Nucleic acid binder design. Structure first.
Ligand SMILES: [Mg+2]
Ligand SMILES: [Mg+2]
Ligand SMILES: [Mg+2]
Ligand SMILES: [Mg+2]
Ligand SMILES: [Mg+2]
Ligand SMILES: [Mg+2]
Ligand SMILES: [Mg+2]
Ligand SMILES: [Mg+2]
Ligand SMILES: [Mg+2]
Ligand SMILES: [Mg+2]
Ligand SMILES: [Mg+2]
Ligand SMILES: [Mg+2]
Ligand SMILES: [Mg+2]
Ligand SMILES: [Mg+2]
Ligand SMILES: [Mg+2]
Ligand SMILES: [Mg+2]
Ligand SMILES: [Mg+2]
Ligand SMILES: [Mg+2]
Ligand SMILES: [Mg+2]
Ligand SMILES: [Mg+2]
Ligand SMILES: [Mg+2]
Ligand SMILES: [Mg+2]
Ligand SMILES: [Mg+2]
Ligand SMILES: [Mg+2]
Ligand SMILES: [Mg+2]
Ligand SMILES: [Mg+2]
Ligand SMILES: [Mg+2]
Ligand SMILES: [Mg+2]
Ligand SMILES: [Mg+2]
Ligand SMILES: [Mg+2]
Ligand SMILES: [Mg+2]
Ligand SMILES: [Mg+2]
Ligand SMILES: [Mg+2]
Ligand SMILES: [Mg+2]
Ligand SMILES: [Mg+2]
Ligand SMILES: [Mg+2]
Ligand SMILES: [Mg+2]
Ligand SMILES: [Mg+2]
Ligand SMILES: [Mg+2]
Ligand SMILES: [Mg+2]
Ligand SMILES: [Mg+2]
Ligand SMILES: [Mg+2]
Ligand SMILES: [Mg+2]
Ligand SMILES: [Mg+2]
Ligand SMILES: [Mg+2]
Ligand SMILES: [Mg+2]
Ligand SMILES: [Mg+2]
Ligand SMILES: [Mg+2]
Ligand SMILES: [Mg+2]
Ligand SMILES: [Mg+2]
Ligand SMILES: [Mg+2]
Ligand SMILES: [Mg+2]
Ligand SMILES: [Mg+2]
Ligand SMILES: [Mg+2]
Ligand SMILES: [Mg+2]
Ligand SMILES: [Mg+2]
Ligand SMILES: [Mg+2]
Ligand SMILES: [Mg+2]
Ligand SMILES: [Mg+2]
Lengths: 170, 136, 98, 48, 96
RNA sequence: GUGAACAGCCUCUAGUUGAUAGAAUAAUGUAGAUAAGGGAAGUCGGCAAAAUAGAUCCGUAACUUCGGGAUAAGGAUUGGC
RNA sequence: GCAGUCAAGCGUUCAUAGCGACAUUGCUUUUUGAUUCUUCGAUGUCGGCUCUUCCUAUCAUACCGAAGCAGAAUUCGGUAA
RNA sequence: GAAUGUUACCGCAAUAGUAAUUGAACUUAGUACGAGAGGAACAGUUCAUUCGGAUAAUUGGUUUUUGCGGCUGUCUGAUCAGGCAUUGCCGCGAAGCUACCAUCCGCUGGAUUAUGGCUGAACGCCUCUAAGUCAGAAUCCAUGCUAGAACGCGGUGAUUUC
RNA sequence: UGUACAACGGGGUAUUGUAAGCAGUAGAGUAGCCUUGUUGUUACGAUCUGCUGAGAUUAAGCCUUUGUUGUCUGAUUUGU
RNA sequence: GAAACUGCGAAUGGCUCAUUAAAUCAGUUAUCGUUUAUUUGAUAGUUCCUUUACUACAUGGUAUAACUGUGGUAAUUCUAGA
């Protein structure tokens, strides 16, 4: 099954395909939220700890947290709820949902690094991707740089350069 | 299991001998089905031909649309209430005995099926497979 | 090979074991043995049957250390200021004064 | 000694259970090593 | 790990929980033959080479076990190993 | 005592404890029972067996000599404190 | 009841693929008659149920020969119980 | 089960019995054949019917396990714990027994018939037949399987002192 | 006279479904005492809860035992 | 000025005449028996704390879409993880 791992420190994320069910078997009967020692998944992840965050089984149905039962159910999903974006004010639909207990029918296990191991992963620790946006509210700037509200936020806002053919802008 | 049966069927505990009555689970107008015979059954002094999930039977309709009554027609068994054992080791059983009325080819007289259906029957008759919702 | 659980008690149904029952509404019930099944046919309620899982969970039995503390935290403390924002000019200004 | 149950895949191309798990009964016969304590040799006669 | 396999890996012999009923606690090499055999438990049995080669496609199949049952036969057995038992049960008025 | 009761079931008083005995528990019996799914296909024939059942309340057809039919049929309820 | 021999005919043509009159020769003894030998100091005298074995004049199944056998279907015949 | 010295083990096989059965689907193939309409089979594969011999992992039935629990009536002052009611009634119930209601297993050589042929005279030709001969069936004989002659037999171990 | 056999006890296995005892601010409530209540008190009350997946039963054709106790030469017959 | 958030509208309109016989409906009443987005007209010096070593008012808090990236499903105005 495919493994959708993420290193939230660098914003990195690479996918892995693990065959050899003995290695997959570690995640079986584990819920979303429990931590996994990677040494059992493989050797490249030795000392790496993984957070189980979700995933989609075959037929692409997502997992929903805390909905135990390594099977599918059909919940009545509402506003502010996982695996559902409404279409009308006060709209609910009954949709299928895959449980939060890992099973062999999962196409992809979504994983989150919690502790680094002893070997840099290929495109996960070796590379880092910067955050997209910057602080736009006044006080959030004062707390991204620790500004002590006398330091004139107007100069501490972030500027993003951009090229227009032969005119570099800001 | 006779004409137009697509594939074979691993043996499954017989549960409906001649004279049993099963719910008719299609929308044809019939309510029940009185079994009078089983296609493909054999012979032994004093045995009653019984039918298992997936067998085609000859039946009459005791309760239903008057046009459906007083006449013998094929029908396909879609639910047994007598446990049987699949090759994956499970003994399973439905809550009724149920079937749908068909023509000798295997096509169905009614447009849908109001029940679960045994896969041993869905695998065997495509027309039942179409009209079925939840299977097993 | 999946080990199933009893839909009345909570017992592990290893392969072959127990019996399976397709109810009229196509809801499926598995039992590990004819005990749970007869209770189930009797319309008994697992939360009132002292040895079932659904009973013991409800009456909070034997779950003592499953509600204790743990140690599952992390530590990152990284920086990657803003995409396209000349991050090589965003560290010579992130030198907090107070 | 007795019997038990076995679960195994089924390699039988064409069977509706091909490459699928089946559960099966087996007997077990306790077979500690036998010990050789003699040899006898037989000849052919018009009587057997 | 007589009763373990390439897929099971739980270290355990073929002896079921609390012993083969009416026989004992198999502790020597053994033969596991598919299905059933003439005779009853504790009886002397002869296993003999086939008198003919079978092509048959049913023989010549090279089986490989996934999981061998080792739950108790003296009742409606629910656990393969005693470890599994304490795992699912919890702790009782005796143990500790 | 239970209960409508001289019913059945248990008790007090009184009277019995009389009926060859011992060891086994094969077949076939005699007498008592239970059986998955089907439900009379068995049979001359539902023979045998099973199902039903008390009470309070609701409800009750044709037909009739108006008296009946009628516990028609069909339902609900029933402990303890 | 079953099977023959002759072959006038039937079979568009063509006696005999398949049939076959007028005649004629047989076999069989689950038809019915004819008879009255055995039993009238008694051989339990319909049918079914159950169970076993036997016969072949073979309905099916194995292998064959033939056709008015293109195929498919069928029909005649052989070894066959 | 007496007696062929005693007793024990391991064996041989005379004779007798004997068993497997039928179907369908896939594929061959919309093929051969046919103007068309229609429309096969050998090989291979998956299942099935009828029969048989076992077997009890599993599921199911059975319950005096009177094993646990529950219930009515009564009797032991109450409690505890029990007796009686032709096994009082009810739920669950292991063990055993048991079911196409459950699972497993059911061998392969030869010789022949019908028939089709080889070579080939009688009969300078011709002929499967006269001599000689090939192929050949749910047949038959074996193989296999069950019994083992209690007056059929082999090999082998030990063989008594008051 | 010993991987001996037995009778018990122990451990496993298994069946039932939570023993007796005690306790409780659980309990529709009910009575009795007065100092007639700013939880007033002594108790009683189907039932519920805790100690408690407890207790009971488990080879009579279940398994296993470093424990305890015991047993271990009666009779008859046979030779080429 | 895409996307998206937010706000509002989607309860109007249009269609049909199935049900409906003291119901609907019509004329005539009642709200001293109630809710009312909106439009219009009015309407707000009081908010703190045992009330000097004092409360951000020169204005307090995160947590999200879009987006970036990694993904699942034969399949949809499906959506998951980061
Ligand atoms: Mg798919
Ligand atoms: Mg028939
Ligand atoms: Mg009959
Ligand atoms: Mg359709
Ligand atoms: Mg049972
Ligand atoms: Mg007297
Ligand atoms: Mg007498
Ligand atoms: Mg007597
Ligand atoms: Mg006696
Ligand atoms: Mg008897
Ligand atoms: Mg019963
Ligand atoms: Mg029955
Ligand atoms: Mg009925
Ligand atoms: Mg009837
Ligand atoms: Mg009849
Ligand atoms: Mg009559
Ligand atoms: Mg009747
Ligand atoms: Mg009667
Ligand atoms: Mg009954
Ligand atoms: Mg009447
Ligand atoms: Mg009441
Ligand atoms: Mg003539
Ligand atoms: Mg001609
Ligand atoms: Mg002519
Ligand atoms: Mg006749
Ligand atoms: Mg006479
Ligand atoms: Mg006489
Ligand atoms: Mg006589
Ligand atoms: Mg007489
Ligand atoms: Mg003949
Ligand atoms: Mg011609
Ligand atoms: Mg011939
Ligand atoms: Mg015969
Ligand atoms: Mg014969
Ligand atoms: Mg002598
Ligand atoms: Mg085709
Ligand atoms: Mg033509
Ligand atoms: Mg047969
Ligand atoms: Mg049998
Ligand atoms: Mg049993
Ligand atoms: Mg009792
Ligand atoms: Mg009482
Ligand atoms: Mg008490
Ligand atoms: Mg008495
Ligand atoms: Mg009496
Ligand atoms: Mg059989
Ligand atoms: Mg052989
Ligand atoms: Mg021979
Ligand atoms: Mg010849
Ligand atoms: Mg000759
Ligand atoms: Mg000649
Ligand atoms: Mg044969
Ligand atoms: Mg054989
Ligand atoms: Mg002898
Ligand atoms: Mg001898
Ligand atoms: Mg408890
Ligand atoms: Mg001890
Ligand atoms: Mg409108
Ligand atoms: Mg928040």
């Amino acid at each position: 099954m495919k493994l959708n791992i993420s290193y939230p420190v660098n914003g990195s994320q690479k996918t892995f395909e693990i065959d050899d069910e003995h290695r997959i078997r570690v995640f079986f009967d584990k819920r979303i939220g429990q931590e996994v020692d990677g040494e059992a998944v493989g050797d490249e992840f030795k000392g790496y700890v993984f957070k189980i965050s979700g995933g989609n089984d075959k037929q692409g149905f997502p997992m929903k947290q805390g909905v135990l039962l390594p099977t599918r159910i059909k919940l009545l999903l509402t506003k502010n709820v996982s695996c559902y974006r409404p279409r009308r004010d006060g709209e609910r639909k009954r949709k299928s949902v895959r449980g939060a207990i890992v099973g062999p029918d999962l196409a992809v296990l979504a994983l989150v690094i919690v502790k680094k191991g002893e070997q840099e992963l290929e495109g996960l620790t070796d590379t880092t991707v910067p955050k997209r946006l910057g602080p736009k509210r006044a006080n959030n700037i004062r707390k991204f740089f620790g500004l002590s509200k006398e330091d004139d936020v107007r100069d501490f806002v972030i500027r993003r350069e951009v090229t227009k053919g032969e005119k570099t802008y800001t | 299991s006779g004409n137009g049966a697509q594939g074979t069927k691993f043996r499954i505990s017989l549960g409906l001998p001649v004279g049993a009555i099963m719910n008719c689970a299609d929308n044809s107008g019939a309510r029940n089905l009185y079994i009078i015979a089983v296609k493909g059954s054999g012979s032994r002094l004093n045995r009653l031909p019984a039918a298992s999930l997936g067998d085609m039977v000859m039946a009459t309709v005791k309760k239903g649309k008057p046009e459906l009554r007083k006449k013998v027609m094929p029908a396909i068994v879609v639910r047994q209430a007598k446990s049987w054992r699949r090759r994956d080791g499970v003994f399973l059983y439905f809550e009724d005995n149920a079937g749908v009325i068909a023509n000798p080819k295997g096509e169905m007289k009614g447009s849908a099926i109001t029940g679960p259906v045994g896969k041993e029957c869905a695998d065997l008759w495509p027309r039942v497979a179409s009209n079925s919702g939840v299977v097993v | 090979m999946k080990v199933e659980i009893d839909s009345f008690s909570g017992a592990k149904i290893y392969p072959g074991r127990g019996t399976l029952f397709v109810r009229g509404d196509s809801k499926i019930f598995r039992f590990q043995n004819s005990k749970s099944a007869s209770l189930f046919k009797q319309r008994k309620n697992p939360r009132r049957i002292a040895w079932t899982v659904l009973f013991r969970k409800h009456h909070k039995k034997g779950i003592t250390e499953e509600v204790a503390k743990k140690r599952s935290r992390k530590t990152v403390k990284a920086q990657r200021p803003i995409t396209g924002a000349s991050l090589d000019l965003i560290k010579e200004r992130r030198s907090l004064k107070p | 000694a007795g019997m038990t149950t076995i679960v195994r895949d089924l390699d039988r191309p064409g069977s509706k259970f091909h490459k699928r798990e089946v559960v099966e009964a087996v007997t077990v016969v306790d077979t500690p090593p036998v010990v050789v304590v003699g040899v006898v040799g037989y000849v052919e006669t018009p009587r057997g | 790990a007589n009763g373990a396999t390439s897929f099971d890996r739980t270290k355990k012999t073929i002896t079921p929980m609390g012993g083969f009923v009416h026989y004992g606690e198999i502790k020597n090499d053994f033969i596991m033959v598919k299905g059933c055999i003439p005779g009853n438990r504790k009886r002397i049995v002869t296993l003999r080479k086939s008198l003919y080669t079978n092509t048959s496609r049913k023989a010549l199949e090279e089986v490989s076990l996934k999981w061998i049952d080792t739950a108790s036969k003296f009742g409606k057995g629910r656990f393969q190993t005693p470890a599994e038992k304490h795992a699912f049960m919890g702790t009782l008025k005796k143990d500790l």
